[PDB]
Structures are given as structure tokens and as C-alpha cells.
Amino acid sequence: DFHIPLPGRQSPDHARAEAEQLAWPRSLGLIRSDAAAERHLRGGYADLASRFYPHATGADLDLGVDLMSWAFLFDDLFDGPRGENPEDTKQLTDQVAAALDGPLPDTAPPIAHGFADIWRRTCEGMTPAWCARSARHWRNYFDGYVDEAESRFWNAAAQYLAMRRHTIGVQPTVDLAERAGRFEVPHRVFDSAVMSAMLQIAVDVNLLLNDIASLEKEEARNMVMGWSKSRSVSHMQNEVRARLEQYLLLESCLPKVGEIYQLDTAEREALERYRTDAVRTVIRGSYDWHRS
Structure with missing residues (x-):
């Protein structure tokens, strides 16, 4: 267990989003067999999206489901030898990242057309x-996959944190909470040192909690890996407790941070929505999801 003093929340429309989660990836060629569909349902990805985005329903939540569906389907393409060679990793990430620059050629792999469909819907209604x-x-996020594929090639602590703080994919998840909620945190408060420290805690706690739930599967094939075990789990368990206590300290600075950046009434409300629906949800959501 861990000390997560945030309220657990889940979208009330989670049942419909979970029932219809297969329609989108099958129409994009991401899931092509019935066994691959059942393997997708066993991941609980729509359930995870409903906890990351409890404030979203309908099409807004569907976009959150598809992002989780795509993010896990994309990550699977690097479990084999591709994730060992940084050249083969970058060859794939470049074809997906090209969707950010404009339309993709029809010869792009299906995982790239799926990302383009997500990025198109993510940008609708948001400021440039x-x-x-x-x-x-x-x-x-894509550059992080190439960096980790290089680390696995050489067959080679803040050294582990500096690399995981990009590949964990927390920030693109938080970004979608804004789109799913149809609000935007004030851009100058996002860049603030206080919000930057809060977002880093969200990333650190996520990768720590992810290594705890992935210790057994990786042991058969991590931050816990130096002296002894269990106590190492207890050390990481205290690290998420210290970071969560620091996160609460930083949350109390936001009222004065809003005055420093002279936020108006709408900007103060957007910052509050970003705190509860985007940052708190990405921390608590992954904890309640690992305990399904």
C-alpha cells in the first residue's frame, strides 16, 4: 500500500466507454483478431481512462479510452527485438511523430494512422x-523510446529517474485531461516552478508505483534493483509518501501563485480544474487502477 491522500474518482459513463472500447482500434487496424480483442479487454484500459478522466463522458471519455488503447498497443510494438535496437525504434517513432507535422502518407503503419486520429481529435477546440x-x-515521449532502446543496446538513482520521466507517458495523459474537460490551465502557470514540481511528483510516483506492480513479471524476465529487498520496497514506499506530502505543500502555494501571475476569475477556475481533474487524477487514478 501507499499514502495517496486523494479521493478516488471514476467517470459515471465508464460502463458505456468500456463496452464500446473495441470499435475504434478495430476500425484503425490496430486489433485484427478476436484473440487480440480479448487480450485488449484484459488490460482494463477504458477502466484506467475513466479514472484518469472522471470529469469526462461520451465522446470526450471515448477519446480518453482510445488514448489508453493506443498507448498500450504502441508500447507492445517494442517488447520484442525492436525495443533492443535504437535504430529500429526511431524508425517507427518517426513515422508516428510525423503525424504532428501534418498528414501521413497512406503507406504509414496502422499504429501511426491511429495516433493521427487521436492527435486530430485532441487539437479540436484548443488554442494553437x-x-x-x-x-x-x-x-x-517518442524521443524517450529511442533513448531507452539505446540503453538496452549497450547492456548497461537519478540515472534511472532521468530516463523514465519521459517514457512513462504521464504528461500526454495529463494533457488529454484538459482536452477531455474542455479547459486549459493558464499557460504561464503551467510553466511555473510550483506546477512544474507538482507535475514531476506525478511522474515520479507513477513510475515508482508501476515498478511495484511490475516486479514479479520483470523478475521472471526496475527501481527496486543496493542492499536487500522489501526494505527497498519500504524505501520506495516512503519516497511516494514524502513526495505526496510535498505535493500537498505545493498545492497550498497555488493561491499565491495565481496572484503572482495575476490570474482572473476564469483562469483561477481553470487552474483549479487542472489541479483536481488533471494532476490529482493522474496520481490517484493509476493507484486505484492497480488495485482493481
């Missing part, structure tokens, strides 16, 4: 500055 910033977050 929001789309540009979110496009930069996707490139850091």
Missing part, C-alpha cells in the same frame, strides 16, 4: 499555443 505545447510533449 496548447496544441504546440502538447505536440512538444509527444516528441519528448
Whole structure:
């Protein structure tokens, strides 16, 4: 267990989103066999999206489901030898990241057309500055896959954190909470040191909690890997507790941060929505999902 003093939330429309989660990836050629469909349903991806985005229903939640569906289907393409060679990794990531620059050629792989369909829907209704910033977050995500594929090639602690803080994919998840909620945090508050520290805690806690739930599967094939075990789990368990206590400290600074950046009434409300529906949800959502 871990100390996560945030309320658990789930979209009330989760049942419909979970029942219809297969229609989109099968229409994009991402899932082509009935066994692949059942393997997809066993992931609980729509359930995870409904916890990341409890404030979304209908098509807004469907976009959240598709992002989780695509993110896990995309990550599977690197479990084999491709994830060992940084050249073969970058060859695939470049074809997907090209969707951020414009239309894709029809010869693009199906996983690339699926991302393009998600990015198209993500940008609708958002400011140009929001789309540009979110496009930069996707490139850091794709660049992280190439960086980790290089680390696996050489067969080779803050060294582990600096690499996982991009491949975990937390920031593109948080970005969609804005699109799913049809709001935008003030851009100057997003870049603030306080919000930057809050977002880093969300990434650190996510990769720590993910290594705990992935210790057994990786042991057959991680931050826990130095002296002894269990105590190492207890050390990481205290690290998420210290970071969560620091996160609460940073949350209390937001009222004064809003005055420093002279937010108006609408901007203060958007910052509050970003705190509860985007940052808190990405922290608590993955914890409640690992305990389904």
C-alpha cells in the first residue's frame, strides 16, 4: 500500500466507454483478431481512462479510452527485438511523430494512422499555443523510446529517474485531461516552478508505483534493483509518501501563485480544474487502477 491522500474518482459513463472500447482500434487496424480483442479487454484500459478522466463522458471519455488503447498497443510494438535496437525504434517513432507535422502518407503503419486520429481529435477546440505545447510533449515521449532502446543496446538513482520521466507517458495523459474537460490551465502557470514540481511528483510516483506492480513479471524476465529487498520496497514506499506530502505543500502555494501571475476569475477556475481533474487524477487514478 501507499499514502495517496486523494479521493478516488471514476467517470459515471465508464460502463458505456468500456463496452464500446473495441470499435475504434478495430476500425484503425490496430486489433485484427478476436484473440487480440480479448487480450485488449484484459488490460482494463477504458477502466484506467475513466479514472484518469472522471470529469469526462461520451465522446470526450471515448477519446480518453482510445488514448489508453493506443498507448498500450504502441508500447507492445517494442517488447520484442525492436525495443533492443535504437535504430529500429526511431524508425517507427518517426513515422508516428510525423503525424504532428501534418498528414501521413497512406503507406504509414496502422499504429501511426491511429495516433493521427487521436492527435486530430485532441487539437479540436484548443488554442494553437496548447496544441504546440502538447505536440512538444509527444516528441519528448517518442524521443524517450529511442533513448531507452539505446540503453538496452549497450547492456548497461537519478540515472534511472532521468530516463523514465519521459517514457512513462504521464504528461500526454495529463494533457488529454484538459482536452477531455474542455479547459486549459493558464499557460504561464503551467510553466511555473510550483506546477512544474507538482507535475514531476506525478511522474515520479507513477513510475515508482508501476515498478511495484511490475516486479514479479520483470523478475521472471526496475527501481527496486543496493542492499536487500522489501526494505527497498519500504524505501520506495516512503519516497511516494514524502513526495505526496510535498505535493500537498505545493498545492497550498497555488493561491499565491495565481496572484503572482495575476490570474482572473476564469483562469483561477481553470487552474483549479487542472489541479483536481488533471494532476490529482493522474496520481490517484493509476493507484486505484492497480488495485482493481
